[PDB]
Amino acid sequence: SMSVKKPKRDDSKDLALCSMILTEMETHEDAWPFLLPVNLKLVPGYKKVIKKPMDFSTIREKLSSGQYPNLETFALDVRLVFDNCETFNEDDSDIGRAGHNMRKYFEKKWTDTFK
Numbered sequence: 001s002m003s004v005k006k007p008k009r010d011d012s013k014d015l016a017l018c019s020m021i022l023t024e025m026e027t028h029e030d031a032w033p034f035l036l037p038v039n040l041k042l043v044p045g046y047k048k049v050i051k052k053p054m055d056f057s058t059i060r061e062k063l064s065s066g067q068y069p070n071l072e073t074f075a076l077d078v079r080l081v082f083d084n085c086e087t088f089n090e091d092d093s094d095i096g097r098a099g100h101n102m103r104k105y106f107e108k109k110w111t112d113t114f115k
């Protein structure tokens, strides 16, 4: 509260670390469904069903241009990619499996890096 401050994380390396995690995501062999935004003109249902599309290239642009206030807003966008994937794909599909795999991959890097 006013004039009562918590000790807080050293956050000075967060940008670099998030960039490294994103690079690791981008180069994972199962990243292919998530590298670019889904084409809303060509994919039936996607525009109506998925209220907030997100993809790695959009996250990369936001990270490169100061549009994440903190590391938690970055993690929210990454998770959104995989949450969207679950909404639109059966677990028993190539893309459904890819999303589950990438999510697991991300959360371990996240834990290992920041927790």
Ligand SMILES: O=C1CCc2ccc(O)cc2N1
Binding pocket: 033, 038, 043, 046, 084, 085, 088, 089, 095
């Ligand atoms: O999540 C997605 C991205 C859009 C898409 C297009 C074609 C398809 O067979 C599956 C998908 N799932």
